[PDB]
Structure 1
Amino acid sequence: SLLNSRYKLVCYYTNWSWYRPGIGKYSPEDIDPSLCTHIVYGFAVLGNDGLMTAHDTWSDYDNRFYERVVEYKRYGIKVSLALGGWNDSAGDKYSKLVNDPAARAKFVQHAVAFLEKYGFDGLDLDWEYPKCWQVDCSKGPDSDKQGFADLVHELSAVLKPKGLLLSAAVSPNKMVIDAGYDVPVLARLLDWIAVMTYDYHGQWDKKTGHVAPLYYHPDDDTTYFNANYTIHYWMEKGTPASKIVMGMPMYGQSFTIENRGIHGLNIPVSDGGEPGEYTRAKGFLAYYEICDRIRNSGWTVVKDPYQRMGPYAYKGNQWVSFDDVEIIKKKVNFIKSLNLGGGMIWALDLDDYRNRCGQGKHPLLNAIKTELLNPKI
């Protein structure tokens, strides 16, 4: 079992996946307890009073979603609550908090009481990002770095004596890592660091690219935009391998390409791809939306024979890059070879949990589990 192994498999849960039609609906009881060692509930948010608060009272509270995910502690899974996420990280409110010691002191006592009220095992910090607010390093003050480090210390000082966990989801981008993170302090105090080794490329690049390359590719604009560089950089900055869990995407980045005639990497893009029926977000497709396009709508798949990155698929002017089972096995062997703490997925509700594509239920996540449990490297 994963729980008896030397590896973590940290699964993000998202409360908003409930609000999807038909088979895209995901509920707490859809969580497969054999596939995760840790479940992280996305998200709670930062209230205007500087205190953590529920993001969606109808699900989290009225329909007892918090309690129904904390249910999984009964299997020996550790269940944490994540604070933040992309939308909540817009603007200055996390910076205002961490630069104000009085506000941090108030926040910390309330946050631990909040976790204990609902039975969470710990807190996951997902501020995107200290200093580089929503990856704009011109926006935030340098002092976000020390402020975040002191927030992590102050949370640790209250959580650790109670046996509660503290983790963070962190940038894979060199520039953001350098500006936002006091890596030695975080590495010492956090129980794990979930490196978000995905979203390296997307519609914002104005050209096609892979959501989550593992190794450098000769046509890359930089040597930094791949999981191999990112994970080694976190270690170079002072993170122990055992503290790192490597993120893997259960989804793809989609693109509307400018001309249907060329369809390779780095080709011009006019917009995000057309939204999926279930996830309804331009530029984004769940794995179960992608595999259906390939299986039943004739999308053409291009693989990398050197396995530096997963596949992409295209049809007409639509183009999506994503991870398949093959590249996932390669990434998990990479995790094992570096003796990392384990793997992480974003997110439970985006894998093909319903077996819509006939590859079995949870094909990507089961591929991770099987390779993590395989002794050979």
Structure 2
Amino acid sequence: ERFKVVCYYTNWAWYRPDNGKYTPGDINPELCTHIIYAFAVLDKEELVIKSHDIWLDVENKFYEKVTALKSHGVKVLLGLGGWDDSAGDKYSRLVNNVSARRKFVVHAVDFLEQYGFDGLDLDWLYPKCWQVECEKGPDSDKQGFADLVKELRKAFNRRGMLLSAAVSASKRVIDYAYNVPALSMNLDWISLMTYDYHGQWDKKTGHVAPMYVHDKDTDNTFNVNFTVNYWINKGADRKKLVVGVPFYGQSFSVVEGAGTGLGAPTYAGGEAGDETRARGFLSFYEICERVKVKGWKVHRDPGGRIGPYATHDDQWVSFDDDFMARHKAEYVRAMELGGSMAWSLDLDDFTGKYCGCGKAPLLTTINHVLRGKEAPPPCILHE
């Protein structure tokens, strides 16, 4: 009750080879206080919420099958947006027009109630910095988003619905996008997306979610600790801040002869995993498979500032393991924040067959720290 564990469920994890396949029946409600159903999308024409996958969400009742878990004491919200749906100006057009916001709020309330959702989690990435491009949006996206949140807050309070938002971890995006005091006041929690600080786009090996500054770092703001303290210094309520932990790694293909170190030049994303089928990232269970069966070498930071990374040939993937996930959850408790967020349920070793540290090892670890679930010690991968 004191700490939230916000779990992102992704509907497209259904369209995955049997061993990676994740359905609403795979959710363990004991491991979440709040489930976010990712994603719904904004209709480009009407600027209202709509299903991104009618066949799954509606025809096969995946919306209702997830909101049905509220009988376990879990709150279930619909996530609107995500990275891919945040392309273009549709959300900016929405928040900069008073008539469109008003029609969005009225429709959103009934859309959510029609499927039994307890609320809405805003995942516009990002106000003003459309898909991280801060030159694209107007400076007024900041107030428009703030005003959309205020108007949703007042409309939701009369219905008992929850309102939250997933937000960037980048200092520069925060400055352009977020009225931090207004958002903290009007949102039930703020999910800091404290990951994807580094990836194939840097063209150098880096860690997906550094905890503290590392000496090889070029920028001392690209770490979880800065993001949290920055939101606090910008005026945020500690108890509203929810620290996101990635259940997946950023993978790279390193230029030949550049070594296996941090900051080694890369020419492409890593080879795709069998289940996630996406160059540039691997699920946690795919990383376990590579360490246990394929002999990938785990490299750790003795200073505890970043999680591990794994290597084989010119492949390189940085990720959070059980030890770093425990630390980030312990960091939330030590800092008295709102809780932890998991992206995403399906990228954890939810079956337990890959990592051999029980079912949902990463999520179990977080629940152990924040909610007192007795658990085994962290699993050592190298073993």
Query: Which one of the candidate residues 362, 365, 369 is aligned to 1:364?
Result: 362
In the alignment, the residues of structure 2 paired with residue 87 and residue 325 of structure 1 have an alpha-carbon distance, to the nearest angstrom, of 29
* Match of residue 166 from structure 1: 163
Q: How far is the alpha carbon of 1:267 from its aligned partner?
A: 0.5
Deviating above 2 A after TM superposition, structure 1's stretches of 4 or more consecutive aligned residues are none
Q: How far is the alpha carbon of 1:34 from its aligned partner?
A: 1.1
Residue 190 (structure 1) aligned with residue 182 (structure 2): no
Query: Which one of the candidate residues 7, 13, 16 is aligned to 2:3?
Result: 7
In the alignment, the residues of structure 1 paired with residue 216 and residue 210 of structure 2 have an alpha-carbon distance, to the nearest angstrom, of 12
Q: How far is the alpha carbon of 1:374 from its aligned partner?
A: 4.8
* Match of residue 156 from structure 1: 153
In the alignment, the residues of structure 2 paired with residue 91 and residue 58 of structure 1 have an alpha-carbon distance, to the nearest angstrom, of 25
Query: Which one of the candidate residues 339, 342, 345 is aligned to 1:342?
Result: 339
Query: Which one of the candidate residues 39, 45, 49 is aligned to 1:43?
Result: 39
Q: How far is the alpha carbon of 1:259 from its aligned partner?
A: 1.6
CA offsets per residue over residues 30-66 of structure 1, 9 Å max, x none? 0011100000000110012111100000000010000
* Match of residue 113 from structure 2: 116
Please say if residues 258 and 264 of structure 2, whose CA atoms lie closer than 8 Å, have aligned partners that are also in contact: no
The 3-state SS of whatever aligns with 2:158 is: helix
In the alignment, the residues of structure 2 paired with residue 193 and residue 260 of structure 1 have an alpha-carbon distance, to the nearest angstrom, of 43
Query: Which one of the candidate residues 180, 192, 196 is aligned to 2:177?
Result: 180
Q: How far is the alpha carbon of 1:157 from its aligned partner?
A: 1.1
Query: Which one of the candidate residues 65, 68, 89 is aligned to 1:68?
Result: 65
Please say if residues 291 and 310 of structure 2, whose CA atoms lie closer than 8 Å, have aligned partners that are also in contact: yes
> What amino acid sits opposite 1:292 in the alignment?
E
Query: Which one of the candidate residues 250, 253, 257 is aligned to 1:256?
Result: 253
> What amino acid sits opposite 2:150 in the alignment?
H
CA offsets per residue over residues 279-333 of structure 1, 9 Å max, x none? 1111010001001100100000001111111100010011000000111111111
* Match of residue 319 from structure 2: 322
In the alignment, the residues of structure 2 paired with residue 298 and residue 251 of structure 1 have an alpha-carbon distance, to the nearest angstrom, of 19
> What amino acid sits opposite 1:308 in the alignment?
R
In the alignment, the residues of structure 1 paired with residue 372 and residue 32 of structure 2 have an alpha-carbon distance, to the nearest angstrom, of 16
CA offsets per residue over residues 106-137 of structure 1, 9 Å max, x none? 11100011001111000000000000001010
In the alignment, the residues of structure 2 paired with residue 175 and residue 355 of structure 1 have an alpha-carbon distance, to the nearest angstrom, of 39
Please say if residues 300 and 313 of structure 1, whose CA atoms lie closer than 8 Å, have aligned partners that are also in contact: yes
Residue 287 (structure 1) aligned with residue 284 (structure 2): yes
Q: How far is the alpha carbon of 1:196 from its aligned partner?
A: 0.3
In the alignment, the residues of structure 2 paired with residue 34 and residue 373 of structure 1 have an alpha-carbon distance, to the nearest angstrom, of 10
The 3-state SS of whatever aligns with 1:252 is: strand
TM-score normalised by length of structure 2: 0.96
CA RMSD of aligned residues (A): 1.0
The 3-state SS of whatever aligns with 2:316 is: strand
Q: How far is the alpha carbon of 1:373 from its aligned partner?
A: 3.3
The 3-state SS of whatever aligns with 1:185 is: helix
The 3-state SS of whatever aligns with 2:260 is: coil
Matches within 5 A, 1:291-302: 291-302=288-299
In the alignment, the residues of structure 1 paired with residue 42 and residue 328 of structure 2 have an alpha-carbon distance, to the nearest angstrom, of 34
Distance 1:336 1:221, change over 3 A: same
* Match of residue 17 from structure 2: 21
In the alignment, the residues of structure 2 paired with residue 374 and residue 69 of structure 1 have an alpha-carbon distance, to the nearest angstrom, of 24
* Match of residue 275 from structure 2: 278
* Match of residue 306 from structure 1: 303
In the alignment, the residues of structure 2 paired with residue 351 and residue 89 of structure 1 have an alpha-carbon distance, to the nearest angstrom, of 25
The 3-state SS of whatever aligns with 2:152 is: helix
In the alignment, the residues of structure 2 paired with residue 306 and residue 207 of structure 1 have an alpha-carbon distance, to the nearest angstrom, of 21
> What amino acid sits opposite 1:367 in the alignment?
T
* Match of residue 30 from structure 1: 26
Query: Which one of the candidate residues 125, 129, 144 is aligned to 2:126?
Result: 129
Please say if residues 260 and 316 of structure 1, whose CA atoms lie closer than 8 Å, have aligned partners that are also in contact: no
Q: How far is the alpha carbon of 1:71 from its aligned partner?
A: 1.0
In the alignment, the residues of structure 1 paired with residue 199 and residue 326 of structure 2 have an alpha-carbon distance, to the nearest angstrom, of 23
* Match of residue 202 from structure 2: 205
> What amino acid sits opposite 1:117 in the alignment?
Q
Residue 354 (structure 1) aligned with residue 361 (structure 2): no
Residue 241 (structure 1) aligned with residue 238 (structure 2): yes
> What amino acid sits opposite 2:368 in the alignment?
T
Please say if residues 352 and 362 of structure 1, whose CA atoms lie closer than 8 Å, have aligned partners that are also in contact: yes
The 3-state SS of whatever aligns with 1:24 is: coil
> What amino acid sits opposite 1:33 in the alignment?
P
